[PDB]
Amino acid sequence: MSKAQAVGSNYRVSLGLPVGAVMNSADNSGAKNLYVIAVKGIKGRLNRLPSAGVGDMVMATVKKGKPELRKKVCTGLVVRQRKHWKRKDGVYIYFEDNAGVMCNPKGEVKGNILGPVAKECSDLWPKVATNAGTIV
């Protein structure tokens, strides 16, 4: 999922948004929430959660939203993190805010993205960048 995009795992990182946590939709899908079942890629170990990033592609479910979406498995991409992280630049970014954005396994994101997106995510994911309302 794709997997051919765009590019790499995208350099330094800090996970934090783990399994269980609910994060905002930041999208014009009828969902408001994205609950994370699990995160792609994270192989893990004994009683460690597959923790999400700010780009790391995520399995999800709309815990509350449009009841044509409600229940089921969903997917998306994580877009901002409640907790901070150091960058390639040697600089920390911070939101108290946290959010994802609903998407298909294809790589395609449906429509527009409301509020500030991570730069890293944009770099990784071209579709996100394309319909980005703001990129920091």
């Binding site: 350099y11 170990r45 004994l46 390639k88 630049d89 040697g90």
Partner: protein, 398 residues
């Protein structure tokens, strides 16, 4: 039972397993790079002293890597590296069970290092006064002959040699009436040359610049931060009962099981987490620091371009408590073993790595001299801080 998880990857490493209080107070390694160099230009080892950490913005050196010319920050371990005073030449000869001390030779001009290991020693005391009884070189003309005899013999007879060097810690900030002695095995050329030139150098004093060039990787050594005895929890990185309802301990559960019907080495236990050896490798070395004759400070800024000021690497307030650089120093890549005021040691790489992001050129931009609720950045916090107070403030805290 199977286990049943998978993972249990051996919490820890059995390659540091004896994990005890290390032998040498200084950094020490019983290994050297081998013979394919010139001669005294390649001294191999050196001894430094730690004095803390700063960060330095530079550019990358990698294409396709968030731009090969985009800025990134990185930490750095700055380390006061006083020049050393070689004094003994020592000849090892290779034999049926490794190498042995055939016989040393020592310089006539100096024998104060000997003395320095003496005031701090003895208990009955017959020979503190100034003398000896483990055999050391005195005398002008008669001892000369002996020295000559020694020199030829070692040169002829087998195998490689090292130089008894030592640091000048009196002139360092931390006061110590004993100095740290060291071997710097000599590589390359031929044995005749090697033996010969040590003698010449006794009087002379080697510089860290003499050993390393500004883009060379290091085989870094030291002795880890002495935390003291502590239990199996952060001595091996184990787990615990996070919701907590247990009358035992923070300490782990099974220690072997009824298995070989005894308990094994291979079990994480309560011991100590400090003075251990180890060696971290491939440290880039970012900038060799210059000596400071108590006048100029551009010499410890580095460049004037991109630096764009004149300052020592020492902070705004400086080091009144800790190891204060007045000497030659070294900007490495971030982190070295050992605490902020420790006697490290350095070697050049055992396998001198020729790789990209290792051999390539490094060029710095900003070196920082900041601080928080305490001082600040160089001249900026020096402006606004001094109008308030008359004596309590002098951007010193002294």
């Amino acid at each position: 039972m199977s286990h049943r998880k998978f993972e249990a990857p051996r919490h820890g490493n059995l390659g540091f397993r004896p994990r005890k209080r290390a032998a040498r107070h200084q950094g020490k390694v019983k290994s050297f790079p081998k013979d394919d160099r010139t001669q005294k230009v390649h001294l191999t080892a050196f001894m430094g002293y730690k004095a803390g950490m700063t960060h330095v913005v530079r550019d990358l050196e990698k294409p396709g890597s968030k731009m090969h010319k985009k800025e990134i920050v990185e930490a750095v371990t700055i380390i006061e590296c006083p020049p050393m005073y070689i004094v003994g030449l020592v000849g090892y000869v290779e034999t049926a069970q490794g190498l042995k001390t055939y016989k040393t030779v020592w310089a006539q001009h100096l024998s104060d290092n000997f003395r320095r290991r003496l005031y701090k020693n003895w208990y009955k005391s017959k020979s503190k006064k100034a003398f000896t009884k483990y055999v050391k070189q005195y005398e002008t003309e008669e001892g000369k002959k002996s020295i000559e005899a020694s020199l030829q013999a070692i040169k002829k007879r087998c195998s490689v040699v090292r130089v008894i060097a030592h640091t000048q810690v009196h002139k360092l900030k931390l006061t110590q009436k004993k100095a740290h002695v060291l071997e710097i095995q000599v590589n390359g050329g031929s044995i005749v040359e090697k033996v010969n030139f040590a003698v010449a150098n006794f009087e002379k004093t080697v510089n860290v610049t003499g050993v390393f060039a500004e883009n060379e990787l290091i085989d870094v050594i030291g002795v880890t931060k002495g935390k003291g005895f502590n239990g199996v929890i952060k001595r091996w990185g184990v787990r615990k009962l996070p919701r907590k309802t247990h009358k035992g301990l923070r300490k782990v559960a099974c220690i072997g099981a009824w298995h070989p019907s005894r308990v094994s080495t291979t079990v994480p236990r309560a011991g100590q987490l400090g003075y251990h050896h180890r060696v971290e490798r491939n440290k880039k070395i970012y900038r060799i620091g210059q000596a400071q004759p108590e006048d100029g400070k551009q010499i410890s800024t580095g460049k004037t371009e991109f630096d764009l000021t004149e300052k020592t690497i020492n902070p705004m307030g400086g080091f009144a408590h800790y190891g204060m650089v007045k000497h030659e120093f070294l900007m490495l890549k971030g982190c070295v073993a050992g605490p902020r005021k420790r006697a490290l040691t350095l070697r050049k790489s055992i396998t001198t790595q020729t790789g990209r992001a290792a051999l390539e050129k490094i060029t710095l931009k900003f070196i920082d001299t900041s601080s928080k609720f305490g001082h600040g950045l160089h001249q900026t916090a020096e402006d606004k801080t001094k109008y308030f107070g008359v004596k309590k403030s002098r951007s010193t805290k002294a």
